Amino acid sequence: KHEHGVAQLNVALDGKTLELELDSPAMNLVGFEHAASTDADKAAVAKARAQLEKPLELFALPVTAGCSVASQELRSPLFGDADIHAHYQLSCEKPELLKLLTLAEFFKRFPATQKIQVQLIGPDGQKGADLAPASAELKL
Ligand SMILES: [Zn+2]
Ligand SMILES: [Zn+2]
């Protein structure tokens, strides 16, 4: 599932919990897939890393919701000691306030991404949705 500028995002609101799994070809986030030797390359990777380390900002989860990070995983060689995987588990005090999900912010911060294919699974059932910077909201 590897198309440059296209990323998959699986969501799952289960009571308090919210699980976001983002699989993306590395081209969208760092701007290449050759492991980083240069300094321009190493700063582009650390820029991405510290943006992905702040998932309440990227996914623009409302403050009103009481959202805190329980666990976060960035599977890629580029962030150890080519695709990128980014798994967040969140715990929202007031999950009822999570009415809507804005990738608008994600697009601003990784403008290399033109389309995000979204599999949401609520307690309502299962809903697909393609998101572009134009049309980047999803009724949760
Ligand atoms: Zn590629
Ligand atoms: Zn994972």
Numbering used by the authors: 15 to 95, 121 to 179
From the manuscript:
The structural and zinc-binding properties of PA4063, one of the periplasmic proteins expressed by Pseudomonas aeruginosa under zinc-deficient conditions, are presented. PA4063 has a noncanonical ferredoxin-like fold. Two zinc-binding sites with micromolar affinity are exposed and are located on the same face of the structure. These findings strongly suggest a role for PA4063 in zinc trafficking, possibly acting as a metal chaperone or as a regulator of a transport system.
Two strong anomalous peaks were observed for each monomer (>9σ), revealing two binding sites, according to the ITC experiments, indicated as site a and site b. The same mode of binding is detected in all three monomers of the hexagonal crystal: besides His124 and His126, the zinc ion binds to Glu87, likely as a monodentate ligand, and a water molecule, adopting a tetrahedral coordination geometry. Notably, a few residues belonging to these sequences, which are disordered in apo PA4063, become structured and take part in zinc coordination, although some variability is present.
